[PDB]
Every structure is written in structure tokens, then in C-alpha cells.
């Protein structure tokens, strides 16, 4: 079964670093494109970004030249190195293999937790 946990979130002060973590077993992770999602309080699951198995990626607009994700296919992981946090990214975090923006089912599971718990991201004004 395709089992995600991840880790790596925190608590820090507006302009910090966190680099986020997800293991993958139970599923061929080196054939699976890999997504982070995440979601605050009242907002939709978005995608921040993701890596296809052909080690291309895709970051949201809003994350671009901040974030970088990458992957090590001999550890079945994903990780988002996430720099110059801002107040707007505080959410849970969740790693799925899904990469895909448009809301629908199957992204909407992502944040819900249908995958794994996420990691709690809280990026605090100074």
C-alpha cells in the first residue's frame, strides 16, 4: 500500500528555512511523479510543487526561486527545501504521488490526509 510520511515542518520566524521530508513505501516510487501539497486554514489543497520521475519539476508561482524539491529514488524520498519563509506559507504540508493543480478527488485527498498526516509548516510574523 502506498504509505507517505513525512516530516521536517516546524515553527519559525518569517524569513527562516525548513526542509521537509517524505518516505514512500509500498509503492514503485521511482516510476511515481511526487508532489507537495499543502493547506491553511479555509484554503483549497494546492500543489506547491513537483517532481516527475524524469527529474523535471514544477513549482507554483508563488514558490519559485524559494523552494527546491528534489528526490533520492534509493531512499524512496521526496524533500522540499523551503527558504525565505513567509507568514502566507504556514499550512500542513503533504506529499502524494500526484502533481497535478486542479482541484479534483483525487488532490482534494491529499490534504485530508488520505495518504499520510502531513507535517505542520508555521511561519510566524516578526
Known amino acids: 500500500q502506498v504509505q507517505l510520511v513525512e516530516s521536517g515542518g516546524g515553527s519559525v520566524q518569517a524569513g527562516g528555512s525548513l526542509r521537509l521530508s517524505c518516505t514512500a513505501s509500498?509503492?514503485?516510487?521511482?516510476?511515481?511523479?511526487m508532489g507537495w501539497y499543502h493547506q491553511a486554514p479555509g484554503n483549497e489543497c494546492e500543489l506547491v510543487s513537483a517532481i516527475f520521475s524524469d527529474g523535471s519539476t514544477y513549482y507554483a508561482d508563488s514558490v519559485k526561486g524559494r523552494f527546491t524539491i528534489s528526490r533520492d529514488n534509493a531512499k524512496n524520498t521526496v524533500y522540499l527545501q523551503m527558504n525565505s519563509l513567509k507568514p502566507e506559507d504556514t499550512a500542513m504540508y503533504y506529499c502524494?504521488?500526484?502533481?497535478?493543480?486542479?482541484?479534483?478527488?483525487?488532490?482534494?485527498?491529499?490534504?485530508?490526509?488520505?495518504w499520510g498526516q502531513g507535517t505542520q509548516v508555521t511561519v510566524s510574523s516578526h
Open positions: 502524494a504521488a500526484a502533481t497535478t493543480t486542479v482541484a479534483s478527488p483525487p488532490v482534494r485527498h491529499v490534504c485530508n490526509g488520505y
Open positions: 509500498g509503492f514503485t516510487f521511482d516510476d511515481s511523479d
